[PDB]
């Protein structure tokens, strides 16, 4: 195993592929068919990068410390040529007058994730994947005993791809058209996989090639491949919780609403975060109070014409929905004081947010 590559060709791959056991902290380097493959893994997921080899090379393979190898290459001057060779149980890195000898672990000992069959495949722009994750991600549960709520649901229906996330209290659903007839399939991608799915996008020209199996997901973009194991479990039904025939509808500007709830939040209970909403003819009154008897009150002009109502909400949940929406106007759809509110951009139905209230 021998190769010489321009530092600039190694940079992005090394940055994309980078422990419980020692070898998991190493990169699997393989020279074959005039291509250098770079592989990283944590047992649950795998990232593979392929680099073209223009300069003379010799085939073979080894494993080297991931962060040490990356930091050396990144630390080298702009336009450096990196010569890599094997000399016993060590890897030799040479550029300019710099020399590095790293400790290896055998390529044979590197974990190889089992071969699997794809059931669904589709292509989509990187921007479509970025929107889907960003619109729902904040709604995923944090270390809940119900392990399934800790990931994100990826559902294919008709010609659309959907993302769903919930913690049992609040929900986020985002659907995007894909222009391909797809079968009905639902999978749970873990938190780590979602972070990696998002990490791999550069929003550029290259489309994202997605493959979904029964217990795995694969994403291809340019010369990188990302693979993750799926969450074993059964996600709840999103349709079951979207308000039925709402009799109460409110419109208001996104920024004014976001800022009024953020000011009332300061004077709410630190652990419970309860705010009181009073809705009436073209008006919203938000009130908060805490155990030390401090009080906040915000009044806004809104477009509302239904019955007068008092409903309680956790202000972190409302603000998360509003920070998530990047629009001018917001629609709130309510029924009664003990039922959920649907929050949406007033000019787009691609994303919906459902928040369950609190009694005070």
């Amino acid at each position: 195993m021998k190769f010489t590559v321009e530092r600039e060709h190694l940079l992005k791959p090394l940055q994309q592929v980078s422990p419980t056991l020692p070898i998991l902290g190493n990169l699997l380097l393989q020279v074959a068919d005039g291509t250098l493959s770079l592989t990283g893994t944590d047992l649950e997921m795998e990232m593979v990068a392929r680099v073209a080899l223009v300069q003379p090379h010799e085939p073979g393979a080894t494993t080297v410390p991931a962060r040490k190898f990356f930091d050396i290459c990144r630390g080298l001057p702009e336009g450096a040529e990196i010569a890599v060779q094997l000399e016993g149980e060590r890897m030799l890195v040479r550029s300019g007058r710099s020399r590095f000898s790293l400790s290896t672990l055998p390529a044979a000992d590197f974990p190889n994730l089992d071969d699997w069959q794809s059931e669904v495949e589709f292509t989509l722009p990187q921007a479509t994947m970025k929107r889907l994750i960003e619109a729902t991600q904040f709604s995923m549960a944090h270390q809940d005993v119900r392990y399934y709520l800790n990931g994100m649901l990826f559902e294919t229906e008709g010609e659309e791809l959907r993302t769903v996330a919930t913690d049992g209290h609040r929900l986020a659903v985002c659907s995007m058209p894909i222009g391909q007839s797809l079968p009905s399939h639902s999978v749970i991608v873990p938190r780590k996989g979602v972070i990696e799915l998002m990490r791999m996008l550069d929003g550029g020209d290259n489309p994202l090639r997605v493959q979904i199996g029964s217990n795995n997901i694969r994403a291809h973009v340019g010369d990188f491949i990302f693979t993750s194991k799926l969450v074993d479990g059964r996600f709840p039904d999103y349709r079951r919780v979207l308000p039925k025939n709402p009799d109460k509808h409110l419109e208001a500007g996104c920024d004014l609403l976001k800022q009024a709830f953020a000011r009332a939040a300061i004077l709410s209970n630190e652990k419970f975060r309860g705010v009181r909403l009073y809705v009436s003819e073209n008006q919203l009154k938000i009130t908060a109070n805490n155990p030390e008897q401090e009080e906040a009150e915000e009044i806004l002009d809104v477009t509302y014409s239904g019955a007068e109502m008092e409903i309680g909400f956790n202000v972190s949940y409302v603000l998360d929905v509003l920070n998530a929406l990047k629009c001018e106007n917001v629609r709130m759809m309510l029924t009664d004081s003990v039922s959920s509110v649907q929050i949406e951009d007033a000019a787009s139905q691609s994303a919906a947010y459902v928040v369950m209230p609190m009694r005070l």
């Binding site: 209290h169 929900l171 956790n314 369950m356 209230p357 609190m358 009694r359």
Partner: peptide, 5 residues
């Protein structure tokens, strides 16, 4: 706090 379910 109430449940969605």
């Amino acid at each position: 706090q109430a449940d969605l379910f």
